[PDB]
Amino acid sequence: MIMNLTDKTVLITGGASGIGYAAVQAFLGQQANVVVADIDEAQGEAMVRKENNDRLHFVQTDITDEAACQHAVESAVHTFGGLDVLINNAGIEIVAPIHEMELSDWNKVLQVNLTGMFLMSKHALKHMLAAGKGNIINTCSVGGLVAWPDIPAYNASKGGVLQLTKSMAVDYAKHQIRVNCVCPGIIDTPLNEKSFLENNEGTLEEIKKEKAKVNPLLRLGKPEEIANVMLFLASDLSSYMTGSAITADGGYTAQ
Amino acid sequence: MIMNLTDKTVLITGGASGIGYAAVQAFLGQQANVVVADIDEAQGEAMVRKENNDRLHFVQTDITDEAACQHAVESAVHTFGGLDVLINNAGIEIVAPIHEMELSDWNKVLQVNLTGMFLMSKHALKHMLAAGKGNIINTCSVGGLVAWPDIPAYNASKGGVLQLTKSMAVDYAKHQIRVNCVCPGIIDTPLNEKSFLENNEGTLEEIKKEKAKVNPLLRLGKPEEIANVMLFLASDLSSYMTGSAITADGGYTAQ
Ligand SMILES: NC(=O)C1=CN([C@@H]2O[C@H](COP(=O)(O)OP(=O)(O)OC[C@H]3O[C@@H](n4cnc5c(N)ncnc54)[C@H](O)[C@@H]3O)[C@@H](O)[C@H]2O)C=CC1
Ligand SMILES: NC(=O)C1=CN([C@@H]2O[C@H](COP(=O)(O)OP(=O)(O)OC[C@H]3O[C@@H](n4cnc5c(N)ncnc54)[C@H](O)[C@@H]3O)[C@@H](O)[C@H]2O)C=CC1
């Protein structure tokens, strides 16, 4: 009744898995039209078949390429007639210390996490300015607020996301375009589980237990728990919020 | 459908006016049982008559007195059978510079804004520990993050609220008691209109226009826009959030 997301068009980058996919489900569940922009064509089409929903559309998109970003925005406008909410959720992680990291690896992290956010936002904003309203939601991280160990390029990129979020909030408030971010803690997603095994010793379950011990709530976050923050930020419930960060980390940054 | 506040018992301090009252309305609208603890008996009873709702109960309460805080918690348990959410919303403002401020005035601000929050939380937590779950929501302020001019005691008190919020989050996460705060910007309430006239030159409407201009969104917040943040923090939607602050200030702290 109060979410009021019915007939709103929501473009979600990295929507084919993890937090992005949980966001797809949550928004479809609120009667929003959802457009997923993701680089993984196979996983994207699989998603379309599983969800089997009129309100869902997939468009293959590499956000590091500007033409593809524009095309993703145009796909939303063609398919559902507009674009109310952009969720810049795609991101990658590469583990490497600064003193050993390859420039090409640094750039791969920054290009997806930050440059792609810029490019998607650029073209979404062109449309939202013309339409007279809009909403942008960025997937930041605890890593944008404090440093996760051993992932400096990631942390840096998310620091960029935090300030880009605030910048766009301040520059576009006069045009009624709200811009906020969510800062997730450690979320239990398949992709993350791969990172757990690569960078810690022990079985998957043992590593999960260790990670779920670093949070005051004593558990890892679920993708849907971040998706729910995105619902709030997209809805009119958060109408006086712009340029802000919502932390969802089980108490991690509180200590 | 997803808020899931039906049959949850919510105790709101300062609930008889402004943000507190808007919170009463929002929570009643979500089928929560609401208990208002407020010092103003007349205004409290007036509220009860206007709302005319079985789910609303008023209990006169001076939160600076510990016995009254305990009694407010007990009133919730007796009336509705439990206590799921405490919203520490009551607060006052006194305008005075540090070099001129009377100790008695300093203490009046701290006692309501901070001590009362402690006392209400103390007794709510005793019950929530026994019940095995709970939620505390504190009304902080932009003043807890940066300094509003000319209200140092208020700012100090809200700095206390921010850290008390984080402290309780960290200490009670293991018992599944989530603790968060909302940091409102400038909200258009009747009592804030009195403050506008007392501390600025011009008509009410002229002063409102000036205050609206200092936010990137170019308007004052509405009480219900803060109440809506409280709904989110009370609901299961925010289940992975604890020890966090949600800023709702029209972009004020983003610049
Ligand atoms: N612990 C956690 O899980 C946290 C995650 N986040 C952020 O959440 C976001 C998503 O998280 P997860 O669900 O774990 O990620 P994920 O790895 O599960 O999924 C990300 C999606 O982004 C896509 N993607 C990658 N590069 C792309 C490109 N150039 N163009 C388009 N799509 C691309 C992938 O295909 C994938 O579907 C990321 O920004 C991540 O950094 C933030 C803090 C914590
Ligand atoms: N309006 C604004 O711009 C901002 C407001 N806030 C905070 O929001 C909260 C509510 O704000 P408003 O709704 O404007 O306040 P308000 O003045 O409209 O209402 C506060 C309520 O608390 C009650 N109260 C006062 N002393 C009390 C005591 N000892 N015991 C019990 N109740 C008592 C009052 O009687 C009243 O019903 C406060 O904590 C305030 O500091 C924070 C930042 C900005």
Side-chain angles (χ1 to χ4, degrees), chain A residues 1-49 51-53 55-190 192-212 214-255, chain B residues 1-49 51-190 192-255:
Chain A
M1 55 169 96
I2 53 181
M3 286 293 201
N4 190 47
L5 292 168
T6 306
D7 292 348
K8 303 293 180 174
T9 299
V10 184
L11 169 41
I12 308 178
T13 69
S17 70
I19 290 163
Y21 179 52
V24 171
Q25 292 178 308
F27 277 96
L28 290 174
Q30 293 307 117
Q31 305 306 325
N33 306 314
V34 176
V35 179
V36 170
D38 203 304
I39 198 171
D40 199 333
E41 195 167 303
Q43 213 175 3
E45 286 169 351
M47 172 196 74
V48 168
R49 283 191 294 277
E51 293 296 324
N52 186 46
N53 198 314
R55 308 193 100 102
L56 185 59
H57 184 75
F58 172 65
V59 50
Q60 197 277 340
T61 308
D62 180 350
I63 64 169
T64 65
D65 179 79
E66 185 165 9
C69 290
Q70 186 180 328
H71 186 246
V73 170
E74 293 180 346
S75 176
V77 176
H78 288 141
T79 307
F80 296 116
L83 176 61
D84 300 286
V85 186
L86 165 65
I87 307 185
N88 290 301
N89 170 258
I92 63 168
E93 176 185 280
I94 297 177
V95 179
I98 290 303
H99 77 280
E100 297 179 337
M101 195 175 203
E102 291 291 327
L103 178 52
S104 58
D105 280 343
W106 174 275
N107 286 333
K108 272 155 62 153
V109 174
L110 270 291
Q111 279 172 22
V112 180
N113 294 13
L114 189 57
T115 310
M117 187 173 291
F118 152 56
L119 292 177
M120 289 295 308
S121 297
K122 175 176 178 180
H123 292 277
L125 282 163
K126 288 184 192 286
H127 176 83
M128 290 169 178
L129 283 168
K133 64 191 188 307
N135 191 314
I136 298 173
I137 299 167
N138 297 321
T139 306
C140 192
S141 177
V142 159
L145 306 173
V146 299
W148 289 125
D150 307 314
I151 54 176
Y154 177 88
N155 295 330
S157 76
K158 295 300 191 181
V161 170
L162 180 65
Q163 290 312 105
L164 178 61
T165 299
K166 289 178 185 163
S167 298
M168 293 191 297
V170 168
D171 293 342
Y172 298 102
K174 67 173 74 68
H175 304 281
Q176 296 307 298
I177 297 164
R178 296 172 25 231
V179 186
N180 298 278
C181 68
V182 53
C183 295
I186 308 163
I187 311 303
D188 187 8
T189 64
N192 219 14
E193 292 183 349
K194 190 221 285 286
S195 187
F196 293 167
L197 284 172
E198 296 257 28
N199 301 288
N200 305 264
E201 300 303 311
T203 62
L204 181 57
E205 280 330 293
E206 288 170 351
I207 296 162
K208 279 196 184 188
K209 277 143 174 260
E210 292 167 34
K211 298 271 173 181
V214 298
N215 308 310
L217 283 184
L218 304 175
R219 58 177 188 86
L220 302 184
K222 294 129 78 86
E224 55 263 32
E225 291 178 303
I226 304 309
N228 290 338
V229 174
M230 296 174 171
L231 293 182
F232 180 63
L233 289 176
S235 63
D236 292 334
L237 296 178
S238 59
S239 55
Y240 201 55
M241 296 180 59
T242 193
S244 88
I246 299 190
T247 300
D249 68 355
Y252 187 84
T253 50
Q255 60 184 12
Chain B
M1 56 169 96
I2 53 182
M3 288 293 200
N4 190 48
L5 292 168
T6 306
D7 292 347
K8 303 293 180 174
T9 299
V10 184
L11 169 42
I12 307 178
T13 69
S17 71
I19 290 163
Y21 179 51
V24 170
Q25 293 177 310
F27 277 96
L28 290 174
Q30 293 307 115
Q31 305 306 326
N33 306 316
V34 175
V35 179
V36 171
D38 203 304
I39 197 171
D40 199 334
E41 195 167 302
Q43 213 175 3
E45 286 169 351
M47 172 196 74
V48 168
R49 283 191 294 276
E51 293 296 324
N52 186 46
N53 198 314
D54 280 338
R55 309 192 100 101
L56 185 59
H57 184 74
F58 172 65
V59 50
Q60 196 277 339
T61 307
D62 180 350
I63 64 169
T64 66
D65 179 79
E66 185 165 9
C69 290
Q70 186 179 328
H71 186 246
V73 171
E74 293 181 346
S75 176
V77 176
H78 288 141
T79 307
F80 296 116
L83 176 61
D84 300 286
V85 186
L86 165 65
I87 307 184
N88 290 301
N89 166 261
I92 63 168
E93 176 185 279
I94 297 177
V95 179
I98 290 303
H99 77 280
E100 297 179 337
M101 194 176 204
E102 290 291 327
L103 177 52
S104 58
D105 280 343
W106 174 274
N107 285 333
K108 272 155 62 153
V109 174
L110 271 291
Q111 279 173 21
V112 180
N113 294 13
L114 189 57
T115 310
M117 186 173 291
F118 152 56
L119 292 177
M120 289 295 308
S121 297
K122 175 176 178 181
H123 292 277
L125 282 163
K126 288 184 191 286
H127 176 83
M128 291 169 178
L129 283 168
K133 64 190 188 306
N135 192 314
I136 298 173
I137 299 167
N138 297 321
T139 305
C140 192
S141 177
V142 159
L145 306 173
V146 300
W148 289 126
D150 307 314
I151 54 175
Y154 177 88
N155 295 331
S157 77
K158 295 299 190 182
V161 170
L162 181 65
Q163 290 312 106
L164 178 61
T165 299
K166 289 178 185 163
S167 298
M168 294 191 297
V170 169
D171 293 341
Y172 298 102
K174 67 173 74 68
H175 304 281
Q176 296 307 298
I177 297 164
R178 296 171 26 235
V179 187
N180 299 276
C181 69
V182 53
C183 294
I186 308 163
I187 311 303
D188 188 7
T189 64
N192 216 14
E193 292 183 349
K194 190 221 285 286
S195 187
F196 293 168
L197 285 171
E198 296 258 28
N199 301 286
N200 306 263
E201 300 303 311
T203 61
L204 181 57
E205 282 328 283
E206 289 171 349
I207 296 161
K208 280 196 184 188
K209 277 143 174 260
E210 292 167 34
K211 297 271 174 181
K213 273 150 73 121
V214 309
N215 307 311
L217 284 184
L218 304 176
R219 58 178 188 85
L220 302 185
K222 295 129 77 86
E224 55 263 32
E225 291 178 303
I226 304 309
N228 290 338
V229 175
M230 295 174 171
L231 293 182
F232 180 62
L233 288 176
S235 62
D236 293 334
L237 296 178
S238 57
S239 54
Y240 202 55
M241 295 180 59
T242 194
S244 87
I246 298 190
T247 300
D249 68 355
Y252 186 83
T253 50
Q255 59 184 13

